[PDB]
Protein backbone atom coordinates (compact mmCIF):
# COMPACT_ATOMS: atom_id res chain seq x y z
CA UNK A 1 0.00 0.00 0.00
CA UNK A 2 0.83 3.70 -0.17
CA UNK A 3 1.27 3.72 3.70
CA UNK A 4 3.46 0.94 3.89
CA UNK A 5 5.56 2.89 0.79
CA UNK A 6 5.87 5.51 2.62
CA UNK A 7 7.39 3.56 5.77
CA UNK A 8 9.83 2.50 3.50
CA UNK A 9 10.11 5.80 2.76
CA UNK A 10 10.81 6.92 6.29
CA UNK A 11 13.14 4.46 6.89
CA UNK A 12 15.24 5.38 4.68
CA UNK A 13 14.70 9.45 5.64
CA UNK A 14 16.47 8.41 9.07
CA UNK A 15 19.21 6.12 6.66
CA UNK A 16 20.71 9.85 6.05
CA UNK A 17 19.84 10.70 9.58
CA UNK A 18 22.02 8.31 10.90
CA UNK A 19 24.85 8.78 8.17
CA UNK A 20 24.53 12.53 8.06
CA UNK A 21 25.36 12.51 11.96
CA UNK A 22 28.25 10.12 11.67
CA UNK A 23 29.09 12.95 8.72
CA UNK A 24 28.95 15.84 11.12
CA UNK A 25 31.74 13.64 13.71
CA UNK A 26 33.81 13.14 10.97
CA UNK A 27 33.81 16.77 9.89
CA UNK A 28 34.50 17.77 13.40
CA UNK A 29 37.45 15.41 13.88
CA UNK A 30 38.97 16.79 10.77
CA UNK A 31 38.44 13.46 8.82
CA UNK A 32 38.22 14.65 5.29
CA UNK A 33 38.39 11.39 3.68
CA UNK A 34 35.71 9.98 5.68
CA UNK A 35 33.79 13.03 5.06
CA UNK A 36 33.73 12.73 1.49
CA UNK A 37 32.32 9.42 1.54
CA UNK A 38 29.56 10.29 3.84
CA UNK A 39 28.14 12.65 1.51
CA UNK A 40 28.31 10.04 -1.47
CA UNK A 41 26.92 8.35 1.15
CA UNK A 42 24.09 11.10 1.62
CA UNK A 43 23.53 11.73 -2.02
CA UNK A 44 22.74 8.34 -3.44
CA UNK A 45 20.36 8.67 -0.25
CA UNK A 46 18.62 11.46 -0.77
CA UNK A 47 17.85 10.68 -4.17
CA UNK A 48 16.25 7.73 -3.40
CA UNK A 49 14.48 9.00 -0.94
CA UNK A 50 13.22 11.80 -3.39
CA UNK A 51 12.01 9.70 -5.57
CA UNK A 52 10.36 7.60 -3.15
CA UNK A 53 8.55 10.68 -1.87
CA UNK A 54 7.61 11.10 -5.60
CA UNK A 55 5.76 8.11 -5.93
CA UNK A 56 3.81 8.49 -2.42
CA UNK A 57 2.72 11.72 -4.09
CA UNK A 58 1.70 10.59 -7.44
CA UNK A 59 -0.15 7.43 -5.66
CA UNK A 60 -2.10 9.84 -3.12
CA UNK A 61 -2.90 12.30 -6.16
CA UNK A 62 -3.99 8.98 -8.29
CA UNK A 63 -5.89 7.73 -5.08
CA UNK A 64 -8.07 11.32 -5.03
CA UNK A 65 -6.87 11.41 -1.26
CA UNK A 66 -6.76 15.43 -1.10
CA UNK A 67 -5.40 15.68 2.39
CA UNK A 68 -2.27 13.55 2.01
CA UNK A 69 -1.68 15.74 -1.58
CA UNK A 70 -1.54 18.64 0.89
CA UNK A 71 0.40 17.50 3.25
CA UNK A 72 3.07 15.65 0.66
CA UNK A 73 3.04 18.87 -1.37
CA UNK A 74 4.10 20.71 1.70
CA UNK A 75 6.59 17.94 2.40
CA UNK A 76 8.10 17.93 -0.74
CA UNK A 77 8.60 21.63 -0.38
CA UNK A 78 10.59 21.54 2.10
CA UNK A 79 12.75 18.61 1.56
CA UNK A 80 13.91 20.80 -1.58
CA UNK A 81 14.71 23.07 0.75
CA UNK A 82 17.26 21.21 2.56
CA UNK A 83 18.27 19.22 -1.16
CA UNK A 84 19.70 22.81 -1.88
CA UNK A 85 21.42 23.17 1.20
CA UNK A 86 23.07 19.85 1.14
CA UNK A 87 24.32 20.81 -2.57
CA UNK A 88 25.39 24.37 -0.97
CA UNK A 89 27.32 21.78 1.90
CA UNK A 90 28.57 19.43 -0.90
CA UNK A 91 30.04 22.79 -2.25
CA UNK A 92 31.77 24.02 0.49
CA UNK A 93 33.44 20.89 1.39
CA UNK A 94 34.95 20.91 -2.38
CA UNK A 95 36.03 24.29 -1.98
CA UNK A 96 37.63 24.13 1.29
CA UNK A 97 35.53 26.45 3.41
CA UNK A 98 34.98 24.97 6.84
CA UNK A 99 33.07 27.98 7.82
CA UNK A 100 30.45 27.50 4.98
CA UNK A 101 30.16 23.78 5.78
CA UNK A 102 29.43 24.40 9.22
CA UNK A 103 26.46 26.83 8.45
CA UNK A 104 25.17 24.83 5.92
CA UNK A 105 25.20 21.47 8.37
CA UNK A 106 23.31 23.19 11.42
CA UNK A 107 20.72 25.01 8.81
CA UNK A 108 20.04 21.38 7.33
CA UNK A 109 20.27 20.15 10.75
CA UNK A 110 17.16 22.94 11.72
CA UNK A 111 15.13 22.30 8.48
CA UNK A 112 14.81 18.90 9.24
CA UNK A 113 13.84 18.79 12.75
CA UNK A 114 11.26 21.45 11.75
CA UNK A 115 9.98 19.03 9.14
CA UNK A 116 9.23 16.27 11.62
CA UNK A 117 5.46 17.23 12.80
CA UNK A 118 4.48 17.17 8.95
CA UNK A 119 6.28 13.80 8.34
CA UNK A 120 4.66 12.02 11.44
CA UNK A 121 0.89 13.62 9.95
CA UNK A 122 1.95 12.18 6.66
CA UNK A 123 2.15 8.30 7.78
CA UNK A 124 -1.40 8.95 9.53
CA UNK A 125 -2.99 11.07 6.08
CA UNK A 126 -1.98 8.07 3.96
N1 LIG B 1 15.84 15.57 4.81
S1 LIG B 1 15.84 17.10 4.02
O1 LIG B 1 16.44 18.08 4.93
O2 LIG B 1 14.52 17.34 3.44
C1 LIG B 1 17.00 16.85 2.71
C2 LIG B 1 16.58 16.49 1.43
C3 LIG B 1 17.55 16.31 0.42
C4 LIG B 1 18.91 16.48 0.72
C5 LIG B 1 19.31 16.85 2.02
C6 LIG B 1 18.35 17.03 3.02
F1 LIG B 1 18.72 17.37 4.28
Redesign the pocket.
Known amino acids: SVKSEYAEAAAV?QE??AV?NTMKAAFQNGDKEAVAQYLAR??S??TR??ELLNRILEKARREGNKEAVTLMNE?TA??????????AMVAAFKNGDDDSFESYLQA?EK??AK?ETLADQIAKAL
Request: zero cysteines; hydrophobic letters at 50%.
Open positions: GAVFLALYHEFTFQTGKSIFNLVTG
